[PDB]
Amino acid sequence: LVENVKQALFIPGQSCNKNLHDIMVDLSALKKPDMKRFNRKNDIHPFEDMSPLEFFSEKNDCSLMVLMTSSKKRKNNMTFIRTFGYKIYDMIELMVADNFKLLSDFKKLTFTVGLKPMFTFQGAAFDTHPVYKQIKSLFLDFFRGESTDLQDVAGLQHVISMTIQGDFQDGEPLPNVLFRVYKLKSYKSRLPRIELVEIGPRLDFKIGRIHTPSPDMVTEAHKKP
Amino acid sequence: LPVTVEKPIPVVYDLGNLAAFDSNVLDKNDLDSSNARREEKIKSLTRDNVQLLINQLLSLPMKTT
C-alpha cells in the first residue's frame, strides 16, 4: 500500500557556484541511490514562480527537490521543495553558514551506501513550533528512504542528527538548525555501549522564507486508507 | 560503559522511522558558533539519544537467526 521511495532532484540555480555545488554533492550522497543531479544552471525563482519546479517534478518523477542559489542577501541558499501530485506541497529556504565542513574535512571511513539512516532531533520546538515542525517533517521525509517491517541490526550504521541552536523565546530571531552525521560504533558492556564518529557533512542551516500547503492539499496528501 | 541515560524530560520515539525526539532544554551558549567545544556537545548529546534509541530498538520483537 505504501508508496515508492521518494526521489530527490538536485537543481543548480542561476547563481549556483562551486562551493555550493560541493555542498550539493556531499549532501546528495546521503540520498543515494534515490537521487538525481542536474549539471546545468536553471533560472528558477520559487517564491516568484513555482511552475518550473512542478514541471521538473513531473518529467523526472521526483517529489523531493533542492534548488541551489547564492546572493549576498541569501548566501548558500538551499531551497527544499516537496510536491504532491507534481504540485508544490511546501517550501523552505535553508541557508548554509560559512562554518560548514565537507566530506573531505573528515577521515573517510567504510560506508555502505543505501542503508536506512537513524534520526535524532534535539529541541522541544521540533514538536510545538510550526517552522521547526516542518523542518522535522521535511528531513524525515527526505532521508528515511525505504519503509520496511524488517530491520537488520547490522544495518544500523549511521545517524542523522538535527539540533536547534539553543532554546529561544517568542519574538526573537529563529535559531539555526545544526545538521550533523555520525557513524555508530558499539562495544560490549544485552545492550552495547554506543559511541559516535562524525563523518559529515557538517551544516548550520539559517532559516529563510517558507511556503505552506492549503488545507485542501493537506487533506489529500495526508488522506488515510 | 554505562548504557543507561537519565534525562529530566523523557525521549519520545518513532521506531518505524528509526527516529528519536528529545525535548530537553538546550543552552544557547553551549551551541554558539564561537564556542570552541561546540561539536563535543553536539556529539555527546547525540550519543545519549542514539544510545536510548538503540536500547528501544533492541527491545522490539527480535531474533538472532
Binding site: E3, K223 | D14, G16, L57
Partner: peptide
C-alpha cells in the same frame, strides 16, 4: 543466514504522500 533481525512497529509521524491515494 545468521543475523539479528527486528520487527519495526507502525510509523507514527504523519508524513505527506507524493501522489494521490488510488
Amino acid at each position: 543466514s545468521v543475523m539479528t533481525l527486528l520487527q519495526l512497529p507502525d510509523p507514527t509521524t504523519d508524513l505527506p504522500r507524493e501522489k494521490p491515494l488510488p
